[model samples]
Target: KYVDKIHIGNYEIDAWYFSPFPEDYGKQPKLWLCEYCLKYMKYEKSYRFHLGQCQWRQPPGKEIYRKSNISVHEVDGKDHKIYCQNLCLLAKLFLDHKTLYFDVEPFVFYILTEVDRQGAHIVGYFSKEKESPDGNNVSCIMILPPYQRRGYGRFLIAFSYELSKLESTVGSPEKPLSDLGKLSYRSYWSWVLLENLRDFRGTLSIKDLSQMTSITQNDIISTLQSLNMVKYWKGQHVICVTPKLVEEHLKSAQYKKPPITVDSVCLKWAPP
Candidate 1:
């Protein structure tokens, strides 16, 4: 008889069991690990119940940004390597196998959590390099499977740029984005570009756009070119965002509404 049990938590759906004797060992019960405390659970019901009482589910570090039902926490990687690695390992279950675990010492994790009466449940997060010569503030970003399509991905992306703006540096996420990552970023950039263009009355240059938004020059050019809003004339690259294009892009339902704007009033942060 299967008599042993394990304590499971909110994020685990699978459970495992082990028998003490050879003859008693029939089928192995799948053990589930809690994402917060790394505890194993044997039953789904118990796991669900434990999640409500798990004290470790809240996001680590200081609260950096908060709005609506979500809050972002910033934690130093050196001090929280175990926690950061736990997040990476948990994320790997859903992310591709190619994503390798690495040293978290030189980075800071911006963890996004959904707050409620019980506690704060981790929704997603993005890591930023503490010091990047290439101005890449965001190293990796992931919104857990359950939280996808809810615009938390865009919120995390905007949070990265908000930090970049504070540092007075142009930044972008690390390259080789997954298909979903690419879509999320492309939609975000397109919306930001269109939103900025909507208020202008004169010719806009890539540099002007970069200065206005703090997005990198290369990214600005690439985004405009992708939208057919840039042209080459007399050896000079020109931005050509028309009213019609802006209207169409703004009306497109494919893009998620930007969770935060690039204005200082919306972002409350300063570089450390």
Candidate 2:
């Protein structure tokens, strides 16, 4: 569905792509095209109603990879295989759908891949979280099912730090920088949820991350605590990152941060 020359690597990529005419244009059947699947429609609000969502083919299948692959360089309205959801995911959430500060219009996006492929998966990406005091971004890091045990997630974390170094200087002054840079990726700090640690692991898993980073199991355990990545809610070893926006999160606060899922209230409210 994508060009063979298309590449999805761990480099800080700038995705320049098309989007539906802004809402100010009125509904002349306006719709944004999918970067992976290449489909289109008339409204951002219809995301749920867009029936072809998951069915849309992605360059890498996984959400993050699909978005990373949106760096097509150029495109036309006729590109039928556009992955709208993949692009939408990157566009709205990653590119800051509403606030426009990221200016992801005509083009909109966030930086995930950087010069170095340190060793982690690009789990997810985002533009900005409006609720945040500074509107912190959401960096979606994922550990693929097959590579779950290879300690790749840790590399990705380290790589994220490197990318932040670039974006920090080049990053939009309007957007808040993430904390991933200040702490090991293993540190999970955010809202503390009670129940199966399974839910928490959905975003990031220490056991899987330890294997991915090759960090000793004992070291993993120790770092997890030192980083304040763990939250004890109702007896479960809940993993959460302290969002920089909230002062109460000082316990797990990583001075320099990245987009941690636990911080986004919008993402948390989504029904599983």
Candidate 3:
């Protein structure tokens, strides 16, 4: 067994097996970590070999949500410390060195995966604060380069908002969003706001929009501002939903590729 490079999306990274314990290094053949089982492999050959045979595609904890071939599982930080930390390490390689290694005790992970007849493969994931005072439900989100542009990024974002809805709180992603992250979120918030406002003939305030979508007031305002839907009327900012904007919104909603979604029927989480 020898080490080799594996392609994650368009990015190629060295396939090296890291062990949680130092002593385990030379005790056995050098192994690679299988994304599915979080188990070690002797090398790329064995990793591929195991990928075809491993049955533990489901996450360590209970399944919280599922849609089509995608599934989300929630795992406590403390319970799956090693796996969570490893995930962060793997993601950091593609995340522009912005994500820092930190204590996972205060957060819970929402792992997203793609499943099929063979097994489930890790695509991307996000972490949420268990008790955030700022109402930041999403701390970090990523979709592997291989999984990019597949709507999985939007799916994860919608899932975070869905959780906020269940918790009955307005929520937003943690600040300092990556360029791609900002684009994804802006697109999502814009569509959500436009769709929710489609039926209303009356003007709406930022707070009104916030209450309707469980999005933070600042974010709502930002989305409206980007769309030129905000107007300064009588020294106060008001959301102006023009006919042209409505038409654009409808067109955007109709033509959006892959279609952003959250399968509520398959969702099975209760507020903690």
Please report how far candidate 1 places residue 61 from its true position, in Å. 0.6
- Report the lDDT tens digits of candidate 1 across residue range 116-152: 8766777778877888877887887877666787778
> For model 1, what is the alpha-carbon lDDT of residue 38?
49
Off by over 4 Å in 3: 1-31, 39-42, 45-55, 252-255
- lDDT by residue (tens digit), candidate 2, 164-271: 333331111231222332233334222221111324335656555433433333445555566466776686665575444234443344433444221121111111
| Count of clashing residue pairs in every prediction | 10, 50, 3
Pairs in clash, predicted candidate 3? 9-146, 31-41, 32-41
- Report the Cα lDDT for residue 107, model 2: 26
Candidate closest to the true structure, highest lDDT: 3
- Which structure among the candidates has the greatest TM-score? 3
Kindly report which residue stretches of model 2 are placed more than 4 angstroms away from their true locations once superposed: 1-84, 87-139, 169-184, 187-272
State the local distance difference test value for candidate 3. 0.74
- After superposition of all CA atoms, the RMSD between model 2 and the true structure is 17.0
Given candidate 3, what's the lDDT at residue 268? 98
Question: How many backbone clashes are present in model 1?
Answer: 10
